[PDB]
Amino acid sequence: IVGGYTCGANTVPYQVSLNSGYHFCGGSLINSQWVVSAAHCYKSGIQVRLGEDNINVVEGNEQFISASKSIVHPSYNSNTLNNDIMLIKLKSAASLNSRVASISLPTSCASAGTQCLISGWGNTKSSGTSYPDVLKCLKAPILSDSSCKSAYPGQITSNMFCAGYLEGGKDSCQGDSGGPVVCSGKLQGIVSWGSGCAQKNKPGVYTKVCNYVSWIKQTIASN
Numbered sequence: 001i002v003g004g005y006t007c008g009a010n011t012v013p014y015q016v017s018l019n020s021g022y023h024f025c026g027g028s029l030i031n032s033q034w035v036v037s038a039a040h041c042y043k044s045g046i047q048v049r050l051g052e053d054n055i056n057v058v059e060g061n062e063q064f065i066s067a068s069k070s071i072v073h074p075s076y077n078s079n080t081l082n083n084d085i086m087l088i089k090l091k092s093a094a095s096l097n098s099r100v101a102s103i104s105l106p107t108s109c110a111s112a113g114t115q116c117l118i119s120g121w122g123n124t125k126s127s128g129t130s131y132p133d134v135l136k137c138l139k140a141p142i143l144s145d146s147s148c149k150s151a152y153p154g155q156i157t158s159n160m161f162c163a164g165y166l167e168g169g170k171d172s173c174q175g176d177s178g179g180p181v182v183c184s185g186k187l188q189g190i191v192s193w194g195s196g197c198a199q200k201n202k203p204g205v206y207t208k209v210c211n212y213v214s215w216i217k218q219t220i221a222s223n
């Protein structure tokens with residue numbers, strides 16, 4: 001997250017870190033057994049880390065649980081990033097508490113102008129690299145689909161939305177991928193892609209979760 005703020009420990013209780021020896025992507029806890037992330041974060045050998053603040057220090061609220069199964073969306077296209085969503089099932093159920101909590105799925109799509117919370121452990125610089133140990137946060141609005149499409153000609157599908165600031169300076173970045181965009185208590189986006197990070201006229205692009213609720217619910221119901 002570039003241009004954000006330190007969230008505070010366990011203030012984003014649905015935020016998970018996906019670990020394969022190191023943090024590599026975020027995700028969102030949606031029930032005691034399932035995490036939502038980006039399909040482009042897929043890899044084998046994932047350990048889901050819940051209850052994290054400092055990802056390099058055991059602070060006392062963590063739950064580390066191996067993934068038993070990952071399900072990339074049927075229609076994920078890695079070249080365009082269309083349908084950039086996956087589900088990860090945990091080998092054992094998380095113990096839900098005030099610091100480890102699921103986030104609700106949307107019932108309707110969000111609208112341009114709604115202010116959302118974006119979070120992660122990704123790069124905090126837009127020229128240069130610095131990776132934080134503690135969780136970072138950014139409050140940002142959803143942008144209109146017309147401004148999103150004009151920012152990224154030929155690239156924005158109906159399964160994507162833009163959020164952030166056209167003036168630059170505030171955005172998600174490398175290492176935030178797969179993490180949450182939460183608006184009014186609902187998971188509306190997944191950190192997906194962008195041109196660089198925090199660049200003028202280049203807002204963040206996010207997977208449009210509301211399009212996937214049916215798939216998510218049916219997948220959980222049979223897996």
Ligand SMILES: [Ca+2]
Pocket residue numbers: 052053054055056057058059062
């Ligand atoms: Ca920790």
